[PDB]
Design a protein around this motif. Structure first.
Motif, PDB file in Angstrom:
ATOM      1  N   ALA A  15      12.673  -1.099   4.464  1.00  0.00           N
ATOM      2  CA  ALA A  15      11.283  -1.024   4.898  1.00  0.00           C
ATOM      3  C   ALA A  15      10.839  -2.269   5.654  1.00  0.00           C
ATOM      4  O   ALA A  15       9.809  -2.229   6.334  1.00  0.00           O
ATOM      5  N   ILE A  16      11.586  -3.371   5.550  1.00  0.00           N
ATOM      6  CA  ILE A  16      11.241  -4.573   6.300  1.00  0.00           C
ATOM      7  C   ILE A  16      11.420  -4.339   7.794  1.00  0.00           C
ATOM      8  O   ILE A  16      10.572  -4.733   8.604  1.00  0.00           O
ATOM      9  N   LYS A  17      12.520  -3.692   8.184  1.00  0.00           N
ATOM     10  CA  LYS A  17      12.748  -3.389   9.592  1.00  0.00           C
ATOM     11  C   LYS A  17      11.823  -2.294  10.104  1.00  0.00           C
ATOM     12  O   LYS A  17      11.566  -2.232  11.312  1.00  0.00           O
ATOM     13  N   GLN A  18      11.318  -1.431   9.219  1.00  0.00           N
ATOM     14  CA  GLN A  18      10.406  -0.377   9.652  1.00  0.00           C
ATOM     15  C   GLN A  18       9.049  -0.937  10.055  1.00  0.00           C
ATOM     16  O   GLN A  18       8.343  -0.325  10.864  1.00  0.00           O
ATOM     17  N   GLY A  19       8.669  -2.088   9.510  1.00  0.00           N
ATOM     18  CA  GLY A  19       7.401  -2.713   9.815  1.00  0.00           C
ATOM     19  C   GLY A  19       7.485  -3.655  10.997  1.00  0.00           C
ATOM     20  O   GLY A  19       8.433  -3.631  11.786  1.00  0.00           O
TER      21      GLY A  19
ATOM     22  N   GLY B 240       7.000  -5.438   6.871  1.00  0.00           N
ATOM     23  CA  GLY B 240       7.054  -4.059   6.430  1.00  0.00           C
ATOM     24  C   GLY B 240       5.664  -3.448   6.341  1.00  0.00           C
ATOM     25  O   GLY B 240       4.701  -3.911   6.958  1.00  0.00           O
ATOM     26  N   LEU B 241       5.570  -2.381   5.552  1.00  0.00           N
ATOM     27  CA  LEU B 241       4.283  -1.753   5.307  1.00  0.00           C
ATOM     28  C   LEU B 241       3.505  -2.560   4.269  1.00  0.00           C
ATOM     29  O   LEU B 241       3.998  -3.544   3.710  1.00  0.00           O
ATOM     30  N   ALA B 242       2.270  -2.141   4.002  1.00  0.00           N
ATOM     31  CA  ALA B 242       1.407  -2.823   3.036  1.00  0.00           C
ATOM     32  C   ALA B 242       0.572  -1.805   2.266  1.00  0.00           C
ATOM     33  O   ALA B 242      -0.658  -1.780   2.370  1.00  0.00           O
ATOM     34  N   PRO B 243       1.217  -0.934   1.477  1.00  0.00           N
ATOM     35  CA  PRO B 243       0.446   0.027   0.677  1.00  0.00           C
ATOM     36  C   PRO B 243      -0.410  -0.640  -0.391  1.00  0.00           C
ATOM     37  O   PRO B 243      -1.599  -0.334  -0.525  1.00  0.00           O
ATOM     38  N   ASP B 244       0.188  -1.553  -1.156  1.00  0.00           N
ATOM     39  CA  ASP B 244      -0.492  -2.239  -2.247  1.00  0.00           C
ATOM     40  C   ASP B 244      -0.977  -3.635  -1.880  1.00  0.00           C
ATOM     41  O   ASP B 244      -1.586  -4.302  -2.724  1.00  0.00           O
ATOM     42  N   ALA B 245      -0.722  -4.099  -0.653  1.00  0.00           N
ATOM     43  CA  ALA B 245      -1.077  -5.471  -0.302  1.00  0.00           C
ATOM     44  C   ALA B 245      -2.585  -5.682  -0.284  1.00  0.00           C
ATOM     45  O   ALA B 245      -3.056  -6.785  -0.586  1.00  0.00           O
ATOM     46  N   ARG B 246      -3.357  -4.651   0.059  1.00  0.00           N
ATOM     47  CA  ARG B 246      -4.807  -4.753  -0.045  1.00  0.00           C
ATOM     48  C   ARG B 246      -5.278  -4.879  -1.488  1.00  0.00           C
ATOM     49  O   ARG B 246      -6.455  -5.179  -1.715  1.00  0.00           O
ATOM     50  N   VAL B 247      -4.394  -4.653  -2.455  1.00  0.00           N
ATOM     51  CA  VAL B 247      -4.684  -4.849  -3.873  1.00  0.00           C
ATOM     52  C   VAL B 247      -3.889  -6.023  -4.437  1.00  0.00           C
ATOM     53  O   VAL B 247      -4.465  -6.997  -4.926  1.00  0.00           O
ATOM     54  N   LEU B 248      -2.555  -5.936  -4.395  1.00  0.00           N
ATOM     55  CA  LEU B 248      -1.701  -6.977  -4.962  1.00  0.00           C
ATOM     56  C   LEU B 248      -2.008  -8.345  -4.363  1.00  0.00           C
ATOM     57  O   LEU B 248      -2.289  -9.304  -5.091  1.00  0.00           O
ATOM     58  N   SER B 249      -1.948  -8.459  -3.033  1.00  0.00           N
ATOM     59  CA  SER B 249      -2.181  -9.753  -2.399  1.00  0.00           C
ATOM     60  C   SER B 249      -3.606 -10.239  -2.622  1.00  0.00           C
ATOM     61  O   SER B 249      -3.840 -11.449  -2.720  1.00  0.00           O
ATOM     62  N   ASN B 250      -4.570  -9.319  -2.706  1.00  0.00           N
ATOM     63  CA  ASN B 250      -5.927  -9.716  -3.064  1.00  0.00           C
ATOM     64  C   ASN B 250      -6.007 -10.167  -4.516  1.00  0.00           C
ATOM     65  O   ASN B 250      -6.802 -11.057  -4.843  1.00  0.00           O
ATOM     66  N   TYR B 251      -5.200  -9.569  -5.396  1.00  0.00           N
ATOM     67  CA  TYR B 251      -5.112 -10.061  -6.765  1.00  0.00           C
ATOM     68  C   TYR B 251      -4.448 -11.432  -6.809  1.00  0.00           C
ATOM     69  O   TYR B 251      -4.857 -12.303  -7.585  1.00  0.00           O
ATOM     70  N   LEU B 252      -3.420 -11.639  -5.982  1.00  0.00           N
ATOM     71  CA  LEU B 252      -2.822 -12.965  -5.866  1.00  0.00           C
ATOM     72  C   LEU B 252      -3.798 -13.950  -5.233  1.00  0.00           C
ATOM     73  O   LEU B 252      -3.845 -15.122  -5.621  1.00  0.00           O
TER      74      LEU B 252
ATOM     75  N   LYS C 294      -4.344  -6.359   9.896  1.00  0.00           N
ATOM     76  CA  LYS C 294      -3.930  -7.715   9.557  1.00  0.00           C
ATOM     77  C   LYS C 294      -3.156  -7.712   8.246  1.00  0.00           C
ATOM     78  O   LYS C 294      -3.695  -7.341   7.197  1.00  0.00           O
ATOM     79  N   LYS C 295      -1.890  -8.130   8.307  1.00  0.00           N
ATOM     80  CA  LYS C 295      -1.102  -8.338   7.099  1.00  0.00           C
ATOM     81  C   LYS C 295      -1.412  -9.680   6.454  1.00  0.00           C
ATOM     82  O   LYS C 295      -1.362  -9.803   5.226  1.00  0.00           O
TER      83      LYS C 295
END
Lengths: 198, 245, 102, 250, 242, 245, 243, 233, 243
Positions: free
Chosen positions: H27-31, H75-87, H60-61
């Motif tokens: 998935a890294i190459k897909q993004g 890659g994609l960011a399905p949970d990044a709007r949650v996980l990275s915001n939690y981080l 914006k990633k």
């Protein structure tokens, strides 16, 4: 501490409740009806602390109409009297005990007899031709069953209630500021708003 | 695994209906035949028994036929253990009505309430409902006698003469043409005994395999009487009705 | 028992100028008679020209104002550093104080 | 986090019944042989104990336990399946009418509540059924004695004299041959010995055959000399020597 | 208990739960209805041939929400009555808050809102019963007809019915009946309804049931004698060859 | 198909499911890390394979030391190794909370065994793929216990992973005959670099980096130190002193 | 079949990749954000000649200065009404102003995408991530008119002109040369109806489609059937004058 | 049958790993192709983010945490709007409670076991998003390369994406030169521009689709876009 | 469908396939042991094999101390062996302060068997097919041995062992128990009772061992200990002086 009254004659029942909005220094509106309109053959009156009494709105009748919608049938007021009081009795041991004095009237079409009940905040159910709560029973009970007769008609029952109002307009410091007359017979609820002008 | 061996028989199956509907009727066919009849003077309820032996003792005699309210009986067709869960459960819901309006409960309240118990197992929870069909018999002050019959699919259909178990369409055919608007207690029993003889493979009809409990109007008084007949009294019914075997 | 009072005192004066705003307060910190700290500025900066200084218990505002400094950033996270409304900037404070209303 | 599997047991089979029920009776046919009889003068509860090793002691294993002093029980099937019902049914019977008024309910409606849980094990998701079938006798109030057969489904079977276990078909007919209105307490024991013991082979000892009687109350089982408002624990079990004494009379 | 999802997402876009939910309506009996000026008429039928029961002792499709609102569904009597009792509580929920009777459009979403959670949230399966919601608004004599799908999709109609071969029966009302010129007399809606009821149940007056929703809290159920009055008029000019 | 490739809740004929056997290959496919148990203390070893010039040395340490008195190190999969690290550290403060004492090595080993076996009892719970190597100094003496990925752990005078353990057993068994109790453990630090250098013959691809984190019974007496400065290059030159080419 | 945990060979979910089918099965809608206003519209078509388009709403309103539409199943449409409208009021409940269209989308996309197998705290019970293509358009107090879209994958991208539906493959291809920076409101009203006419398999009618607009002053205002029929007459007169 | 060792979360592949990571690494190459590095105090993140259409703009990633640190994911960011915001909340939780700068080693330790918890406990899918996180403290800039397999490491620089392997190895010889050059953040960003030209074998350099981030001691964290990157194009 | 390799359902043979593998895999560890009872004491001996110089002999043990009077004998996989040990030690201290008396044999054997029988109900959680034997010395009754089966069935055992040779030692012990007509060893001086059990162990194996190659322990009255390296070696030398 309002003044609520009522009487059950042979063929029907009559209820009269004081109309006032008052907390302690002032009278807001001259007409306040504490009650709800049930099925045409059933009527119920409210008395108690004005805070929790107005909070009723639709609670019990929502379940009563739920049966009237499903089966298109009207239960007798005797069965309803074992329900409202059943829920109010459970509130005493709950977090917030409620204090309300309710009069459950209405007409039973099964046995073709009127029914009027008197229930206080202590959950005491009784079948009486009359009813009162608080200071409203001190100037009445002496004059209620004294001149009351089982064969008394509606016309003789209207002036009988007004006879006790004359004691409430003198002996009672608080003023009722008008009342409302609702009679429940085999036909249904008949609302009469004429008292002082009657 | 867990997801591979789970076929989810509760959700929609591509028969147009549910997996657990059609197959539940097979267990009803193996269940004893219970034919309810609502007469003018009462309601007739007769059911069969499973493997009546010589040393089998009949005292309570209630297996597929019970009584909930004094004025309202109940009949089940299916596994006995699955039915016993909802027997006393309907009484608990009935005793709550006594706590509510303090009077007699119409049958129609418990019909739909208990229908959602088995239907709720297919709706959610991933559980399996019961394949036991219910038959309700009661009295009312409005419609008089009331006789209802449920199904494991969650529906209900009122019937004056109903038959379940084996030979469902065959038993209802004989009672359809023999039905009459005016039937007393003795008239409805003679029609039921002749029908039960053709339902099973046994020889004629016996009292040991006959589970019969009915209701009438009054005994000493004119209202509110019901009694479950002992198997000793069932043998005397064959003499009164004039049909020995 | 529990005593939510115990304020260290101090006098702050909010001043709204024409094109500017002046919020001034003393640095004196006292407890009853004796003095705790002579220099203890309570005036902080929440960003975007928002200066909010309280008068009262220390760990009430300090755990709030400093958290409110980040609370202003929570608006800028999804809004891509959009300027917060200056009139309603303190309107959210009433809702954060409602959790402590008990 | 535990119990993540909510799905029920095997669904409806093409035969119309449940597949888990038919395989449950296999352990009964491969298990010990039990029986029971109501003579109105007593209830004879007898079974056999299979010892797979010569070093095994039969004193620890008890197939017939006491749930309540007026009610005995015996099972045919896997051994440990009954022990878990001991730690459950007794706690359920404790919450039953025993705590509610004065005493445990009679055998008729007590087993109905006990067997109701056994049916819940065949219904609720993630639990699995048992392989055993229990014979629970007892003494009611108005109805006198009681005997009931319990399938893994839990439907009550009001029998008079019945037998289950390995070779139940051959041992059930023998109970139907000799019967009358009321038997003796001693004669009902000799019938069980000529049936249970002669139907099996390899164990001649009385330690591997557990027999108990109901309706006999000894004064030493009460524990107090006070006013006997109730008779007492009618359940009584023969010792090692008392079992062999009955075999000498046959 | 069950943390997974009972819904099956199909790769073709049509959910298997949605596909086979309409088949339950296709197996169930038909419910016919048509709008009107001052009222609305809702007909139905019955699958059972031999009838040993009475309409009063056994209710089937008869359900009421508000005083002027009467709901008639098509499907099983289990999952359908679940949405009916919840709607009655919701009808009170508007009377316990708004103190006003809820309209038909807002009440329709609540029936679809429960089905909305089925198609979305797992742990519970959707139903197979489609409902036809018809009622009156306060101080409004114009009825409404909404076809409620198990997927939570409703739409406005004029003459609409669901059931066995109901799409073909509805085609009869697509020409002779016009939504631009609705009939006036209440009995005129029955004349077009009885002709549409004979294309499914065909013979017999027992299964045919007509429920006419009228204003001022009035519900009239036509008997078998009044239905046969329009049956004779069907064969009068149809059998004659001009 | 076979049931051992999906569900670990069943029983294997040999005692170990095929799923658990798959975790063994992940242990040997990791980086070689050994351990030392002698009279002067317990010495660990860790290596970081450099696959590119972008990697920065003296940064990643696979040895996770619980407080100063207990070291631990894993191999193979990083997340399965570090998941157990948070389990021991959180309970290390919980141990000092209740008993207000430091935790001995044997008390620390039971917390790991009960934690791994609980994952194999449930099919919905996933066990690890890695082997845990832990040790340190307690109030008694030097103890080295390694937790296998199957959950089995017992007394070990040495540990091995990555390159085959039989290759590491050559130099470990020779130290027993020379030193019965191990004697001086400081020379074993140079021997540790030689044992890891033995695995560098077949595994040589790119540049290698070696790190050592140890603890002593005598010098530290429960404290913690690290090899750096002169001691860092002294042990490295000893491994290349035997074979220069 | 099995759980959602199984991924694609490209590392994506099955329910996300196969959700594009329900997008085309829905209505054909093309949003356009011009210099003056923002053009919104959908396609009702017909399911029957007796179908009434009066009581069906395929275009909702989250707030006055913004707008929304739907193409797909209505289950995931009204679910955002209880969320996006709540979050818009929640912003006015706290910061008492118009939420940024750029921020509102990412704020909704946080609530728009929640699913999985199961979770204790969050509700993952939703199976399909989206079966409906939701339009997001409005006016920003800082930048200006912004046209966004809710994708079935839960992500979001800034779109100058967005085209969804079954005919979106041929509509969006030529949409590159149709959209310009000089495109005004009046010029974009007849341009959308011309493109939707080619995708529509039936005749253009007031009941076969629904259009609206977003105004920075009066707000979101739907086009009445009498006003929608005027745009149809202006299209027929313009198409005849092109040659 | 592939999904035995793949579709099941608790299963073990014959190599000991989980095939869910194999699809997660792809998935890294897909993004979008991202590039980042660090030299001493200053760290530069140059992330190229493509779109689906000419009229379409990317999302914006990169999520701004604080002035002394930043993050860029591929890659994609399905949970990044949650996980990275939690981080990101943990970044403020560390500042408002622990007051520490939250070194990348601690931030990646919790995320290493957080993605593993989904595989350990049934009922959830893994994440499968590569994260490149940089941070600054008294010890200098520290880069965190976070793989979907729970990789915790520190590099001077790395390049992940589609066909980004060529630009990753080509900069290894000049790595020691970039770290010794300080005080000129413009030349450090231009060093990443050369990595973009080497990592694109298909199209040329974009303008608005290019995102550049930088962090330092006096210079806070910021994202260069529009006219800010005009000198770096 | 129908296979027990994942889900546990009743087999047509009347026995679960999981119970088969539980009974099929017992001695896979390839180790033996024995348990006998003396008059006032209890003697247990377990074989041990350590083909390594890096293994600490004081660590590996198949006999763990539960209570002061309670021993234990376990054969099976090492990780699953301590699963029942840690649970039994936590339950031993609970029963002590629950009903006010130390854990006897009739309780611990029942609680662990009932806990294992609950695993028959639960299809998600894995049961334990590990051989479990609970040995102790009761001050009131006396020595008792209860060997817990993987199916949860326990019964009084006068003697027990492990491995495939369990039936071989049983033959020699049954002949001595038949003439003496006693279930336990009536001989005092447990020091000579340990050597008495080794004689029956040598007949099954046929080879000698060292002090660290044999796990031996003695359960005395109100005490349970473990023989050290010096106490074990003393008995292996002293037995050679007799015969």
């Amino acid at each position: 501490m309002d003044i609520i009254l009522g009487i059950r004659v042979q063929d029907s029942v009559i209820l009269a409740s004081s109309k006032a909005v008052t907390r302690g220094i002032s009278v807001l509106k001259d007409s306040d009806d504490k009650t709800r309109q049930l099925s045409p053959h059933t009527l119920m009156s409210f008395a108690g602390e004005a805070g929790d009494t107005v909070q009723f709105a639709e609670y019990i009748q929502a379940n009563i109409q739920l049966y009237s919608i499903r089966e298109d049938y009207e239960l007798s007021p005797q069965a309803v009297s074992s329900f409202v009081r059943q829920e109010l009795a459970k509130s005493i041991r709950s977090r917030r005990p409620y204090q309300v004095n309710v009069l459950i009237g209405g007409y039973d079409k099964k046995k073709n007899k009127p029914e009027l009940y008197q229930i206080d905040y202590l959950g005491t159910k009784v079948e009486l031709p009359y009813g009162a709560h608080g200071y409203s029973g001190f100037y009445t009970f002496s004059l209620l069953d004294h001149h009351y007769r089982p064969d008394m008609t509606t016309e003789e029952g209207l002036d009988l209630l007004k006879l006790c109002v004359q004691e409430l307009e003198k002996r009672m410091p608080m003023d009722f500021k008008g009342v409302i007359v609702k009679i429940v017979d085999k036909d249904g609820i008949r609302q009469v708003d004429d008292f002082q002008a009657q | 695994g867990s997801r591979r061996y789970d076929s989810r028989t509760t959700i929609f199956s591509p028969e147009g209906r549910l997996y657990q509907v059609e197959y539940a009727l097979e267990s009803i066919s193996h269940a004893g035949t219970a034919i309810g009849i609502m007469a003018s003077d009462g309601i007739v309820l007769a059911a069969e028994r499973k493997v009546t032996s010589t040393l089998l003792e009949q005292d309570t005699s209630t297996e597929k036929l019970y009584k909930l309210n004094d004025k309202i009986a109940v009949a089940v067709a299916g596994l006995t253990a699955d039915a016993e869960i909802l027997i006393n459960t309907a009484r608990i819901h009935a005793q709550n009505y006594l706590k509510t309006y303090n009077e007699d409960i119409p049958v129609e309240i418990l019909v739909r309430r208990l229908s959602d118990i088995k239907q709720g197992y297919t709706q959610h929870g991933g559980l399996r409902p019961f394949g036991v069909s219910f038959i309700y018999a009661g009295y009312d002050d409005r419609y008089g006698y009331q006789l209802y019959t449920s199904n494991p699919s969650g529906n209900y259909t009122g019937w004056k003469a109903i038959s379940v178990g084996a030979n469902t369409s065959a038993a209802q055919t004989l009672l359809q043409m023999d039905y009459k608007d005016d039937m007393k207690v003795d008239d409805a029993i003679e029609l039921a005994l002749k029908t039960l003889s053709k339902t099973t493979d046994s020889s004629a009809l016996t009292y040991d395999r006959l589970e019969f409990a009915t209701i009438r109007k009054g005994a000493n008084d004119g209202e509110v009487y019901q009694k479950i007949f002992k198997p000793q009294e069932i043998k005397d019914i064959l003499v009164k009705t004039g049909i020995t075997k | 028992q529990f005593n939510p009072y115990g304020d260290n005192g101090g006098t702050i004066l909010g001043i709204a100028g024409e094109d500017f705003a002046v919020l001034a307060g003393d640095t004196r910190n006292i407890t009853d008679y004796s003095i705790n700290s002579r220099y203890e500025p309570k005036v902080f900066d929440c960003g975007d020209n928002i200066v909010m200084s309280a008068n009262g218990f220390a760990a009430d505002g300090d755990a709030l104002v400093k958290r409110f400094k980040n609370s202003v950033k929570w608006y800028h996270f999804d809004h891509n550093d959009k300027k917060l409304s200056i009139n309603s900037a303190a309107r959210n404070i009433q809702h954060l104080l409602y959790g402590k209303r008990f | 986090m535990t119990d993540r599997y909510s799905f029920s047991l095997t669904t409806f089979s093409p035969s119309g019944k449940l597949g888990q029920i038919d395989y449950a009776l296999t352990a009964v046919k491969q298990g010990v042989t039990s029986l029971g009889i109501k003579a109105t003068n007593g209830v004879v509860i007898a079974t056999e104990k299979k010892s797979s090793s010569p070093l095994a002691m039969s004193e620890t294993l008890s197939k017939v336990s006491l749930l309540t002093p007026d009610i005995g029980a015996v099972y045919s099937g896997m051994g440990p399946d009954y022990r878990v019902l001991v730690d459950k049914s007794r706690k359920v019977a404790h919450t039953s009418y025993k705590r509610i008024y004065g005493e445990y309910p009679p055998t008729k409606l007590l087993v109905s509540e006990v067997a109701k849980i056994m049916q819940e094990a065949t219904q609720s998701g993630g639990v699995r059924p048992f392989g055993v079938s229990l014979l629970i006798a007892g003494h009611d109030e108005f109805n006198g004695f009681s005997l009931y057969q319990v399938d893994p489904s839990g439907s009550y079977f009001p029998w008079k004299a019945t037998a289950i276990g390995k070779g139940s078909v051959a041992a059930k007919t023998f109970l139907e041959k000799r019967w009358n209105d009321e038997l003796e307490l001693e004669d009902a024991i000799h019938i069980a010995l000529l049936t249970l013991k002669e139907s099996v082979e390899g164990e001649f000892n009385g330690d591997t055959i557990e027999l108990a009687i109901i309706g006999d109350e000894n004064p030493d089982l009460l524990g107090y000399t006070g006013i006997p408002t109730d008779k007492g624990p009618r359940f009584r079990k023969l010792t090692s020597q008392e079992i062999n004494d009955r075999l000498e009379a046959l | 208990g069950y943390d997974r999802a009972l819904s099956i997402f199909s790769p073709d876009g049509h959910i298997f739960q949605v596909e086979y939910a309409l088949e339950a309506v296709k197996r169930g009996t038909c419910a016919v209805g048509v709008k009107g000026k001052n009222c609305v008429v809702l007909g139905c039928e019955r699958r059972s041939t031999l009838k040993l029961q009475d309409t009063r002792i056994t209710p089937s499709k008869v359900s009421k929400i508000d005083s002027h609102v009467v709901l008639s569904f098509s499907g099983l009597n289990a999952d359908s009555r679940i949405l009916i009792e919840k709607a009655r509580v919701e009808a009170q929920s508007h009377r316990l808050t708004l103190e006003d009777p809820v309209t038909v459009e807002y009440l329709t979403r609540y029936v679809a809102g429960v089905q909305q959670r089925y198609t979305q949230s797992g742990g519970v399966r959707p139903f197979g019963v489609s409902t036809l919601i018809a009622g009156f608004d306060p101080r409004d004599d114009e009825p409404k007809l909404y076809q409620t799908e198990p997927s939570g999709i409703y739409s406005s109609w004029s003459a609409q019915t669901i059931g066995r071969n109901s799409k073909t029966v509805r085609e009869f009302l697509e020409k002779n009946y016009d939504r631009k010129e609705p009939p006036a007399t209440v009995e005129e809606c029955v004349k077009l309804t009885v002709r549409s009821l004979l294309e499914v149940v065909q013979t017999g007056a027992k299964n045919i049931e007509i429920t006419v929703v009228k204003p001022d809290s009035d519900i009239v159920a036509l008997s078998s004698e009044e239905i046969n009055q329009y049956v004779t008029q069907i064969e009068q000019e149809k059998q004659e060859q001009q | 198909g076979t049931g051992y490739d999906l569900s670990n809740s069943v029983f294997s004929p040999d005692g170990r499911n095929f799923q658990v056997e798959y975790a063994v290959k992940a242990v040997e496919n990791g980086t070689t890390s050994i351990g030392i148990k002698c009279n002067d203390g317990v010495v660990f070893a860790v290596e970081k394979l450099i696959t590119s010039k972008l990697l920065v040395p003296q940064k990643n340490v696979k040895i996770q030391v619980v407080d100063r008195h207990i070291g631990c190190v894993y191999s193979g999969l990083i997340p399965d190794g570090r998941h157990l690290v948070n389990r021991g550290r959180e309970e290390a403060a919980s141990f000092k909370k209740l008993y207000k004492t430091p935790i001995p090595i044997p008390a620390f080993a039971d917390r790991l065994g009960q934690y791994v076996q609980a994952h194999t009892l449930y099919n919905s719970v996933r066990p690890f793929g890695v082997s845990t190597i832990f040790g340190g100094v307690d109030k008694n003496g030097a103890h080295l216990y390694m937790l296998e990925p199957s959950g089995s752990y017992w007394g070990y005078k040495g540990a091995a992973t990555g390159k085959g353990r039989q290759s590491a057993k050559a130099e470990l068994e020779k130290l027993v005959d020379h030193h019965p109790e191990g004697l001086s453990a400081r020379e074993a630090v140079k021997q540790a670099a030689k044992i890891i250098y033995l695995a560098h013959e077949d595994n040589k691809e790119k540049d290698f980096e070696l790190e050592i984190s140890w603890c002593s019974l005598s010098e530290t007496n429960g404290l913690h130190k690290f090899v750096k400065g002169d001691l860092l290059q002294e042990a490295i030159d000893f491994a290349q002193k035997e074979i220069n080419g | 079949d099995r759980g959602v945990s199984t991924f694609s060979p490209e590392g994506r979910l099955f329910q996300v990749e196969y959700s594009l089918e329900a997008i085309k099965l829905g209505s054909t809608a093309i949003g356009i954000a011009t210099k003056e206003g923002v053009v919104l519209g959908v396609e009702k078509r017909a399911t029957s000649p007796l179908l009434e388009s009066d009581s069906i709403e395929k275009i909702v309103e989250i707030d006055r200065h913004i707008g929304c539409a739907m193409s797909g199943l209505t289950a995931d449409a009204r679910s955002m009404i209880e969320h996006a409208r709540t979050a818009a009021v929640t912003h006015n409940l706290y910061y008492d102003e118009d939420i940024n269209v750029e921020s509102l989308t990412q704020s909704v996309c946080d609530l728009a995408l929640r699913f999985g197998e199961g979770a204790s705290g969050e509700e993952r019970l939703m199976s399909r991530p989206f079966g409906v293509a939701l339009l997001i358009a409005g006016h920003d107090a800082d930048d200006g008119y912004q046209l966004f879209h809710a994708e079935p994958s839960g992500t979001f991208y800034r779109y100058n002109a967005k085209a969804i539906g079954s005919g979106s493959e041929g509509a969006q291809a030529e949409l590159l040369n149709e959209w310009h920076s000089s495109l005004t409101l009046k010029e974009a009203e007849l341009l959308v109806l011309k493109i939707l006419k080619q995708v529509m398999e039936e005749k253009l009618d007031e009941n076969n489609a629904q259009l609206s607009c977003i105004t920075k002053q009066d707000g979101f205002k739907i086009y009445d059937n009498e006003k929608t029929a005027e745009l149809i007459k202006e299209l027929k007169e313009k198409e005849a004058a092109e040659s | 049958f592939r999904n035995n060792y793949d579709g099941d979360t608790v299963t073990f592949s014959p190599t000991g790993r989980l095939f869910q990571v194999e699809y997660a690494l792809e998935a890294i190459k897909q993004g979008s192709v991202t590039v980042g590095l660090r030299s001493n105090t200053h760290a530069v993140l140059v992330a190229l983010k493509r779109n689906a259409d000419e009229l379409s703009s990317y999302q914006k990633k990169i999520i701004k945490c604080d002035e002394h640190m930043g993050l860029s994911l591929a890659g994609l960011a399905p949970d990044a709007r949650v996980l990275s915001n939690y981080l990101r909340q943990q970044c403020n939780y560390s500042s408002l409670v622990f007051n520490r700068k939250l070194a990348v080693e601690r931030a990646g330790h919790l995320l290493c076991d957080k993605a593993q918890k989904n595989t350990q406990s049934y009922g959830g899918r893994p994440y499968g998003v590569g994260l490149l996180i940089i941070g600054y403290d008294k010890s200098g800039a520290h880069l965190l390369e976070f793989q979907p397999s729970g990789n915790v490491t520190e590099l001077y620089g790395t390049a992940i994406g589609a066909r980004s392997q060529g630009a990753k190895t080509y900069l290894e010889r000049t790595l020691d030169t970039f770290i010794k050059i300080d005080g000129n953040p413009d030349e450090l960003i231009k060093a990443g521009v050369e990595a973009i030209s080497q990592s694109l074998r298909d199209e040329s350099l974009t303008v608005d689709n290019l995102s550049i981030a930088i962090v330092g001691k006096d210079t806070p964290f910021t994202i260069y876009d529009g006219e800010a990157v005009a000198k770096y194009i | 469908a129908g296979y027990d390799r994942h889900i546990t359902i009743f087999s047509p043979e009347g026995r679960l396939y999981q119970v088969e593998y539980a009974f099929k895999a017992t001695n896979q560890t390839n180790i033996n042991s024995l348990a006998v009872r003396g008059k006032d004491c209890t003697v247990v001996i377990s074989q041990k094999k350590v083909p390594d110089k890096l293994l600490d002999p004081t660590t590996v043990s198949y006999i763990f101390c539960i209570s002061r009077t309670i021993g234990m004998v376990v054969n099976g996989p090492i990780p699953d062996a301590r699963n029942a040990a840690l649970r039994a030690k936590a339950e031993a201290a609970e029963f002590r302060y629950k009903y006010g008396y130390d854990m006897p044999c009739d309780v611990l054997a029942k609680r662990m068997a009932n806990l294992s029988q609950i695993y028959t109900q639960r299809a998600y959680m894995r049961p334990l097919g590990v051989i479990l034997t609970f040995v102790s010395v009761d001050e009131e009754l006396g020595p008792s041995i209860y060997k817990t089966d993987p199916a949860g069935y326990y019964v009084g055992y006068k003697a027990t062992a492990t491995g495939p040779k369990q039936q071989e030692i049983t033959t020699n012990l049954e002949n001595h128990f038949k003439k003496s007509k006693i279930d336990h060893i009536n001989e005092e001086s447990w020091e000579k009772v340990v050597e008495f059990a080794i004689t029956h162990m040598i007949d099954a194996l046929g080879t000698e061992f060292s002090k660290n190659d044999l796990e031996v322990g003695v359960a005395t009255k109100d005490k349970f200990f473990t023989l050290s390296a010096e106490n074990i070696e003393e008995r292996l030398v002293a037995i050679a002086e007799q015969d």
